[PDB]
Design an enzyme around this catalytic site. Structure first.
Site: not given
Ligand SMILES: N#Cc1ccc(O)c(-c2ncnc(N)n2)c1
Length: 294
Positions: A17, A123, A126
């Protein structure tokens, strides 16, 4: 942590996160990514640590790496919006071509820099591209799949995006090259132009076949060695390549030409970021201001 007075959760990366936080001391607003686990490859902490040395205007600055309590924290300079949100916000009108071109040009500069320093992103998507009010766009996340291999999810059993994965990764190649980033960027370029993902696969095989349905099933002619790839199956259906004018309309020939070179099947024929910067598509590149609503 107690040094940061969290402002809120900003997202959920493939490696944990991300939060927006302010340094109670410095007053600095930063992005904090906490990585998820009982060992903690110190060989990674070392590699990751090296990334702090990466300084380029088109790379989100890694300010600090904090290893503590079986948790790893990456402190990054903060940017207000990611390209996914911006594209969604611009879906009705489309991102103006000069802005698309500016963003692609900057992203290629960022990649040329990382690649010249032997750093692969692996990786790109957008959500990993951040923008600010001054027209800059920067690459975020980064050296992790290398310094971590590849987890099965993100953290909260979230669904990993395969849309930007290069064909050699999908065919099981065990050694990625800088070409994988050019492929992802090509996919992103197309998406900014058409306003729809180029290859929205919902599984690894669907991802691969969507690529094949558009660019043609690769063979030894266009990709020497492809039939020997780990996951290559002679049983793959053989689809004819589609005319490129149908893939990214209404992009002009300079743009289509550049995209075609970023999407070559053979990682070895795929254009490098440095060579891409010299493509005629960038002859009239400028640096427009995006209309950003924060
Ligand atoms: N990794 C990473 C990373 C670093 C800096 C950031 O600002 C962000 C981010 N992610 C999503 N939204 C916004 N606004 N920022 C992510």
């Amino acid at each position: 942590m107690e040094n940061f007075q969290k402002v809120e959760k900003i997202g959920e990366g493939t490696y944990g996160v991300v939060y927006k936080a302010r340094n109670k001391l410095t007053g600095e607003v930063v992005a904090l990514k906490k990585i998820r686990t009982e060992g903690v490859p110190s060989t990674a902490i070392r590699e990751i640590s090296l990334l702090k040395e990466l300084n380029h205007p088109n790379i989100v600055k890694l300010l600090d790496v904090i290893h503590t309590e079986n948790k790893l924290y990456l402190v990054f300079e903060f940017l207000h919006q990611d390209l996914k949100k911006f594209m969604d916000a611009s879906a009705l009108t489309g991102i103006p071509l000069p802005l698309i071109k500016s963003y692609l040009f900057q992203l290629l500069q960022g990649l040329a820099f990382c690649h010249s320093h032997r750093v692969l992103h692996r990786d790109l998507k957008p959500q990993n591209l951040l923008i600010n009010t001054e027209g800059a766009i920067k690459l975020a996340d980064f050296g992790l799949a290398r310094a971590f291999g590849v987890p099965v999810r993100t953290y909260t059993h979230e669904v990993v995006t395969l849309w930007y994965r290069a064909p050699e990764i999908l065919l099981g190649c065990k050694y990625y090259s800088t070409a994988v980033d050019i492929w992802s960027l090509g996919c992103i370029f197309a998406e900014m132009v058409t306003r729809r993902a180029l290859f929205p696969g919902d599984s690894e095989i669907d991802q691969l076949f969507r690529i094949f349905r558009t660019l043609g099933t690769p063979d030894e002619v266009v990709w020497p060695g492809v039939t020997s790839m780990p996951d290559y199956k002679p049983s793959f259906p053989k689809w004819a390549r589609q005319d490129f004018s149908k893939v990214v309309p209404p992009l002009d020939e300079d743009g289509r030409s550049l995209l075609s070179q970023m999407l070559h099947y053979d990682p070895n024929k795929r254009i490098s970021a440095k060579a891409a910067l010299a493509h005629p598509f960038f002859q009239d590149v400028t640096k427009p201001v995006p209309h950003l609503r924060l």
